[PDB]
Structure formats: structure tokens, C-alpha cells
From a paper:
Activation of the large-conductance Ca2+-activated K+ channel (BKCa channel; also called Maxi K or KCa1.1) occurs through depolarization of the membrane voltage and an increase in the intracellular Ca2+ concentration. BKCa channels are composed of a tetramer of the pore-forming α-subunit (Slo1), sometimes with auxiliary β- and γ-subunits and LINGO family. The α-subunit of the BKCa channel has seven transmembrane domains, S0–S6, and a large intracellular domain that contains two regulators of conductance for K+ (RCK) domains. The voltage-sensing residues are in the S1–S4 transmembrane domains, and the S5–S6 transmembrane domains comprise the pore of the channel.
To investigate the activation mechanism of CTIBD at the molecular level, we determined the cryo-EM structure of the detergent-purified human BKCa channel in complex with CTIBD. The final map was obtained from the best three-dimensional (3D) class containing 288,878 particles and yielded resolutions of 4.2 and 3.9 Å with C1 and C4 symmetry, respectively. Despite this similarity, two clear and distinct densities corresponding to the planar molecular structure of CTIBD were observed, positioned within an ∼5 Å proximity of each other. The first CTIBD molecule (CTIBD1) occupies the hydrophobic cavity formed by residues from the S0 and S5 helices. Conversely, the binding site of the second CTIBD molecule (CTIBD2) remains fully exposed to the extracellular membrane face, yet remains anchored to the channel via a phi-stacking interaction between the 1,3-benzenediol ring of CTIBD2 and the highly conserved Trp263 (W263) of the turret loop. The van der Waals interactions between CTIBD2 and the adjacent cholesteryl hemisuccinate (CHS) also contribute to the binding free energies. In the apo state, one cholesterol and three molecules of 1-palmitoyl-2-oleoyl-sn-glycero-3-phosphocholine (POPC) occupy the interface between two adjacent subunits. In our structure, however, CTIBD and CHS replace the cholesterol and POPCs, respectively. Consequently, to avoid steric collision with CHS, the indole moiety of W275 is flipped by ∼120° relative to the orientation observed in the apo state. By occupying the hydrophobic cavity and displacing lipid molecules on the extracellular side of the transmembrane helices, CTIBD plays a pivotal role in stabilizing the channel in its activated state.
Numbering used by the authors:
A (entry chain A): 18 to 51, 91 to 335
B (entry chain B): 224 to 615
Write the structure that this text describes.
């Protein structure tokens, strides 16, 4: 049929923007026009969230695994065409994503219960990830026609690793925490930038009726981003469409500092080897 | 317009303005020179560009990236690039990190606490560091104690470092933090002292000059009292000589809901009271650390010692059935029918002054509603004191 790219983004936009509304209204819906069992539920969710008992421990480990699992599914989905159809009652993939997302929905709900202040929790880095990743799979199962767009965000989840390690009582030292946090930030930024370069370029910028496509597979974009960040430069791959160039300009504007700063520190923390240890 | 009063904001605005200005202007010059030709070739080597490509090329060049896509081709353009490099590189590499640093210096632990009905929250303030927090929290939340239902709230004016973040996160359901001070009567409004129950004060034991430490603690007590008179306070002190000043502040009530714990006094007191009999110091000092019973099988002294280490001291009201009896008799009854020991009785006079007696003799009999100290392994066992009739 005709292109249906517009519908998927919209379903998502509705949840995040719509949510801010209801939250603002409820705070402003008072008449003045300015132990409770609810609190027991709050405490139960809170203890379940982090390492407080066996059940919570397995939940955290399972999240740690399924995040990587979804990231793996994303790579397999890369080489497919931009927008086509996959019947839901026949295949095995697009079900593993379904099971992963139904799980992430409950893990998001539990977090939303056990938060002291709703508003700033709602606009938190980990949150918009789920907001922009959970709708499209359901909408796809509704329409039987999926779309690649805005699935690269599914790589951001790695930011959580530090936290979902500390509860497990595994990292209690300054150096280890510093190193893990830095590596997490770095890998996440790199992969997500690669993802964004892939969706805009493979598809045509809409200004000219989608006729400016330049072919590129996800690995190629990884290379373009690494060459640019380190200032090495090369002429092998240069993004051609307008949107790509604009994003490249802004990315270089801020983030080149990230590669000029983090890498020396990561190199310094590793390699502090005590050469004359032993017995 | 009286819109930028502070310091950092001026720096940030000035930098961003100069940067955007020079960037756009360089783009403009490249566009003008390149779209036009050159005089001494009679205008015959023009390269078709639009402003967008030019600004793209400048931002490619300044940040040392480089690319083989677009490059100025006429003499004037190349000369301009040759000169402009010398300034632009230093400009970019000395401005971008500054702008990144100035923005984003955001206090992560702002905000305020909230009050929840049906529970109780306390506050602490003072020498907050890894050792002290670990010890205090370990003793506070230990499982052997009676079922605990409280929350813990910290204050401090130094952002806690990474190592302590581990502890403050690991008890995600029982510990909360708020940066601020204690001398600023706005901060002490954030923590909601006006509905609290107490405010302990950790004091630095291993200080260099003792006097400054206790002076600061004194002023902390002064301020907390200033915000509210009816508060409870429990603090530390370092020499008996300065302890007295705290007696003076107007609302301390030693008779009701207040106290103070020194160190020097208790230190020398333990030593002296042990001078009459060896080891009494250890026997006392082990009664006030929460510990659990252990298994040891080797026939050393360690097993027989840990046998009694994990004992503790608790309090509970008596039973009505024991009023009309004899203190020796009730002691023997407690031990034989309970496997439980008691030391002293709380207070007996029908007067408005409260006095504490230890090991009463045989001229006293129990009145209705009397509290009594006990020593045993766990609080639940101590509670068996509620009633004993029809039990065998
Ligand atoms: C540098 C560190 C952070 C690791 C970087 C990882 C990437 C360099 C690798 C890891 C996983 C790889 C992917 C794993 C599997 C596939 C499927 C593979 O085959 C198919 O898509 C099957 C159909 C076809 O052949 O077109 C194509 C490459 C791709 C996306 C790979 C592209 C390169 C990836 C992203
Ligand atoms: O395969 C594709 C990819 C992007 C678009 C596309 O088209 N127009 C827009 C825009 F931005 F103008 F709204 C976008 C767009 C841009 C950025 C994001 Cl993050 C998501 C979508 C499309 O149509 C088909
Ligand atoms: O569209 C154009 C633009 C510039 C010239 C042009 O031609 N000759 C000269 C020069 F510099 F030699 F005097 C210049 C020139 C160069 C730099 C500046 Cl800032 C201003 C003018 C022209 O002829 C036509
Ligand atoms: O023919 C054109 C039209 C718009 C721009 C253009 O220029 N700047 C921006 C931006 F985004 F920075 F504001 C944009 C822009 C980007 C996306 C959309 Cl959807 C609409 C406009 C351009 O460069 C050339
Ligand atoms: O055929 C030629 C002639 C002059 C130069 C030339 O070389 N250097 C300069 C400079 F920059 F020092 F002035 C110039 C120059 C610049 C502007 C004007 Cl208007 C005239 C000459 C050249 O490179 C090649
Ligand atoms: Ca015990
Ligand atoms: Mg809480």
C-alpha cells in the first residue's frame, strides 16, 4: 500500500507528550485551583526494584540479559529493507521482540510506582527510551507491517549497567566504578550515533520526494563515526544528504571533546599494574 | 536591561556570541569569494556553491576533521584558508571545552523530601564519611533488633564521592540524601524538621584541634534549636569542660526528651569502674553492639567467648501479676521459668523527680506499671514478660 511511516512515530509521540499533560493537570486539578496500603505497595515495588531479596535479584539479572538481547535483535533487523511486511502468525522473530517488550513494559511500570516525585522521573534518560521503543512493536503487530525508524534508541539501555551492577554488591571501589561508568557512556554514544546515521541516510531526506538515497550498512556507519570522532579523517565515506550533514556538524560541535578526554582516562585506569608484586 | 547579574552567565553568553559571530562571518566571506571568480583570470574559474555548503566546510575545517568532499578551489579562497587556520584552530580548541564545562554544572542532589503519613523520619548532620556512615548504618538496621520502621535522612555541604554512593544506593529503600547546609534556615526547612522525631549529630573523634570541633557542634545545636524549640537532640562532645555550655541554651530539657553523650567522661569512666575488677570494660562495651550468635567447633576460647558476645540489653514493661511479690523471688522466677536475666528497676517514688535504682534489695515490692531492664540474645525473647499465668 501507500507509505505508512508517519503512523508509527505518532503513536509514540502521543504517549510522551500526552503523559506530561495528564501529570501537569493532576498537580493543577485541585479544588483550590492552585499506614496506607498505597504506601505498602510503594515499599514492595521499591524493594523489588533493587537487590533486596531473591526475587528482585533474579529480576535485575533478567533485565541485564534482556537488554543485550534486544540490542542483538536490532542488528539482525538492520539489513532488511526500510519498510515492508512480516506476517505475525508465521515467523519466530518479531515474537522475541514482542516478548522482550512486554517484559520491558512491566519493568517500566514497577519503576514508575516506586518513585518519590513523578514529574522529574517521567523526563529521565532511561524513561524516554522505553517511551520511544515500546509502542511501535504493538502497532506493528496491529498492522502486520513494521518499520525500522527510531529503533536505534534501543541501544541506549546500556547506560543502566552501572546501577544494575551496584545493587548486586559487585563493585565497591572508586576505580572500578569510574572505569565501568566511562566505558558504558562511551559504547552507548558510539552505537547510538551509528544508528542515527543509518536511518536518515539510507532513506531519502523528504525535502525532495525521497530520491537522494546512498546505500550503507550499519557497520559502515560505525566506521564513519569512528573516523570522524578521532579527527583522523579519510575520504572513504562521507554522508551526502542534507539531514546527515547537519547532524554531522552538530555532533562534531560537541562530542569530539568526549573522545579527546575519556580515552586518556580509560587508558590510565587500566594498566596501573603493580610490576613488583608476587612472592 | 539588568538580566545577567551573576558571574558564570556573563562568561557563557560572551563565549557563545563571539563563536557564532565569527563562524557565520567566515562562512559569508568564503561564499562571496568563491561564487565570484578572480580578477586576474577575467572571472573564469567560478565554483558553484550555496551558503549551506560553505558553513559546512568551515565547521569541517575548524575542528580538524577534514574531508575530501568540498574544498575551495580559487587562489583567494586558499589564501584565506591558509591564514584563517592559524587563528581558528586555537579558537575552537580553547573555546569548546570551556563552553561544555560552564554549562551542565548542575547540582544533582537538589530537591526536597516528602512527609508520608503513618511512619517516622529522622535527621543527621555532621562528620559524614565512609567509616562513620557504615558503622552507624550497620548498628541501626541490624536484623536482631525489634521490627524497625523508620527512614534515614542525611545532610552535608560536600557532594558525596563515588565510594559512598555505593552505600547510599544499596539501601535504596531506607536512606535518602539532600545536599545543603545546617546553618541556613532554608535548608532546615527542606528536610522538614518540623515533623521529625530527633536529629543525631556525628562528631569527628580524630580531630587535630579538639576545640574547633566541639565549637562547631555547639553552634549546630544552637541553630537547630533556633529553628524549633520542641525538638529532640542527641549529640557528641569531646571534653567535659565544654560539655557544660550546652546545659545553658534555653530549650534543652534533660528531664524530658533530651540527652548528651560525651566521650572523655565515658572513656575514663569505663577505665576507672574497671579498676576495681579486671575486664569489666569489655563486658560493658560488648553489650552495646548488635551481634548475632555464631558457630565455632575448635576447642579454643573463641567459641566459649562468642557464646556470650552476641548478648544485648533491652527494656520492657512488666506484667501486672508480679506487683505483689519480692524482687529476689521475681528474679529467681524470671531466670528459672524464662532463662532470662534482669539487672535493675526503673523508678519507684510517688514524686515528680525520676531516679534510677540498680539491683534493689529486699525492702521493695513491685508497683503496677513498672519498666525493667533485661539482658538476652534478641528482643523478641525479652517480650515474654507480658504475662506468665497458665504457662508451664
Ligand atoms: C567495536 C565494538 C563496540 C563492537 C562493534 C560491533 C560491530 C562492529 C558488529 C557487532 C555485531 C555486528 C552485526 C552482527 C550480525 C550482522 C548480520 C549480518 O548478516 C545479515 O544481516 C544477514 C543477511 C545479509 O547477509 O544481508 C550483517 C552484518 C551484521 C548486522 C553485523 C554488523 C557489524 C556488527 C554490528
Ligand atoms: O525512513 C524515513 C526516515 C525519516 C523520515 C523523516 O521524514 N521527515 C522527517 C522529519 F524529521 F522531517 F520529520 C523524518 C524524520 C527525521 C528524524 C527522525 Cl528522528 C525521524 C523521522 C522518513 O520520512 C522516512
Ligand atoms: O563578486 C565579486 C567579489 C569580489 C570581487 C573583487 O574583485 N577584486 C577584488 C580585490 F580584492 F582585488 F580588490 C575583489 C574583492 C576582494 C575582497 C573583498 Cl573583501 C572585496 C572585493 C569582485 O570583482 C567581484
Ligand atoms: O531547504 C531547507 C529547509 C530547511 C533547512 C533547515 O535549516 N536549518 C534547519 C534546522 F533544523 F536547523 F532548523 C532546517 C530544517 C531541518 C528540518 C526540518 Cl523538518 C525543517 C527545517 C535547510 O537547511 C534547507
Ligand atoms: O598571480 C598572482 C598575483 C598575486 C598573488 C599574491 O600573492 N600574495 C599576495 C598577497 F596576499 F600577499 F597580497 C597576492 C595578492 C593578493 C591580493 C591582491 Cl589584490 C594582489 C596580489 C598571487 O598569489 C598570484
Ligand atoms: Ca543477639
Ligand atoms: Mg523514599
Amino acid at each position: 500500500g501507500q507509505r505508512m511511516w508517519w503512523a508509527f512515530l505518532a503513536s509514540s509521540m502521543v504517549t510522551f507528550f500526552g503523559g506530561l499533560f495528564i501529570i501537569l493537570l493532576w498537580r493543577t486539578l485541585k479544588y483550590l485551583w492552585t499506614v496506607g496500603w498505597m504506601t505498602s505497595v510503594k515499599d514492595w515495588a521499591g524493594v523489588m526494584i533493587s537487590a533486596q531479596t531473591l526475587t528482585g535479584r533474579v529480576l535485575v539479572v533478567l533485565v541485564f540479559a534482556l537488554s543485550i538481547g534486544a540490542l542483538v535483535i536490532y542488528f539482525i533487523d538492520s539489513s532488511n529493507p526500510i519498510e515492508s511486511c512480516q506476517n505475525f502468525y508465521k515467523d519466530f522473530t518479531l515474537q522475541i521482540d514482542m516478548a522482550f517488550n512486554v517484559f520491558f513494559l512491566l519493568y517500566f511500570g514497577l519503576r514508575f510506582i516506586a518513585a518519590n516525585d513523578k514529574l522529574w522521573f517521567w523526563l529521565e534518560v532511561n524513561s524516554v527510551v522505553d517511551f520511544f521503543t515500546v509502542p511501535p512493536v504493538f502497532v506493528s503487530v496491529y498492522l502486520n507491517r513494521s518499520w525500522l525508524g527510531l529503533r536505534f534508541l534501543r541501544a541506549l539501555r546500556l547506560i543502566q549497567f552501572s546501577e544494575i551492577l551496584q545493587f548486586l554488591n559487585i563493585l565497591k571501589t572508586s576505580n572500578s566504578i569510574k572505569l565501568v561508568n566511562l566505558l558504558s557512556i562511551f559504547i552507548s554514544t558510539w552505537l547510538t550515533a551509528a544508528g542515527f546515521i543509518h536511518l536518515v541516510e539510507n532513506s531519502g531526506d523528504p525535502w525532495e520526494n525521497f530520491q537522494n538515497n546512498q546505500a550503507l550498512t550499519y557497520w559502515e556507519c560505525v566506521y564513519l563515526l569512528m573516523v570522524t570522532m578521532s579527527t583522523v579523517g579519510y575520504g572513504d565515506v562521507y554522508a551526502k544528504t542534507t539531514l546527515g550533514r547537519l547532524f554531522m556538524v552538530f555532533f562534531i560541535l560537541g562530542g569530539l571533546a568526549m573522545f579527546a578526554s575519556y580515552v586518556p582516562e580509560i587508558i590510565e585506569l587500566i594498566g596501573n599494574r603493580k610490576k613488583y608484586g608476587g612472592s | 536591561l539588568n538580566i545577567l547579574k551573576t558571574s558564570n552567565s556573563i562568561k557563557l553568553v560572551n563565549l557563545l556570541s563571539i563563536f557564532i559571530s565569527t563562524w557565520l562571518t567566515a562562512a559569508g566571506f568564503i561564499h562571496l569569494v568563491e561564487n565570484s571568480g578572480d580578477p586576474w583570470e577575467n572571472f573564469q574559474n567560478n565554483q558553484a556553491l550555496t551558503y549551506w555548503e560553505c558553513v559546512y566546510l568551515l565547521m569541517v575545517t575548524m575542528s580538524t576533521v577534514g574531508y575530501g568532499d568540498v574544498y575551495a578551489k580559487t587562489t583567494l579562497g586558499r589564501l584565506f584558508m591558509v591564514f584563517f587556520i592559524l587563528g581558528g584552530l586555537a579558537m575552537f580548541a580553547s573555546y569548546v571545552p570551556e563552553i561544555i564545562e560552564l554549562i551542565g554544572n548542575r547540582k544533582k542532589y537538589g530537591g526536597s523530601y516528602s512527609a508520608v503519613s503513618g511512619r517516622k523520619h529522622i535527621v543527621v548532620c555532621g562528620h559524614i564519611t565512609l567509616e562513620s556512615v557504615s558503622n552507624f548504618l550497620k548498628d541501626f538496621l541490624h536484623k536482631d533488633r525489634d521490627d524497625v520502621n523508620v527512614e534515614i535522612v542525611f545532610l552535608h555541604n560536600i557532594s558525596p564521592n563515588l565510594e559512598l554512593e555505593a552505600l547510599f544506593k544499596r539501601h535504596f529503600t531506607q536512606v535518602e540524601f539532600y545536599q545543603g547546609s545546617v546553618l541556613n534556615p532554608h535548608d532546615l526547612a527542606r528536610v522538614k524538621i518540623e515533623s521529625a522525631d530527633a536529629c543525631l549529630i556525628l562528631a569527628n573523634k580524630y580531630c587535630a584541634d579538639p576545640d574547633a570541633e566541639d565549637a562547631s557542634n555547639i553552634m549546630r545545636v544552637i541553630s537547630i534549636k533556633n529553628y524549633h524549640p520542641k525538638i529532640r537532640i542527641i549529640t557528641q562532645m569531646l571534653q567535659y569542660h565544654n560539655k557544660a555550655h550546652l546545659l545553658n541554651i534555653p530549650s534543652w530539657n534533660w528531664k524530658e526528651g533530651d540527652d548528651a553523650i560525651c566521650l572523655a567522661e565515658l572513656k575514663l569512666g569505663f577505665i576507672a569502674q574497671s579498676c576495681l575488677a579486671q575486664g569489666l570494660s569489655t563486658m560493658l562495651a560488648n553489650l552495646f553492639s548488635m551481634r548475632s550468635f555464631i558457630k565455632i567447633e575448635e576447642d579454643t576460647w573463641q567459641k566459649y567467648y562468642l557464646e556470650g558476645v552476641s548478648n544485648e540489653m533491652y527494656t520492657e514493661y512488666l506484667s501486672s501479676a508480679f506487683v505483689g511479690l519480692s524482687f529476689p523471688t521475681v528474679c529467681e522466677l524470671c531466670f528459672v521459668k524464662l532463662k532470662l536475666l534482669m539487672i535493675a528497676i526503673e523508678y519507684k517514688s510517688a514524686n515528680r523527680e525520676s531516679r534510677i535504682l540498680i539491683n534493689p534489695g529486699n525492702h521493695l515490692k513491685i508497683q503496677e506499671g513498672t519498666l525493667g531492664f533485661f539482658i538476652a540474645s534478641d528482643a523478641k525473647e525479652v517480650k515474654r514478660a507480658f504475662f506468665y499465668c497458665k504457662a508451664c
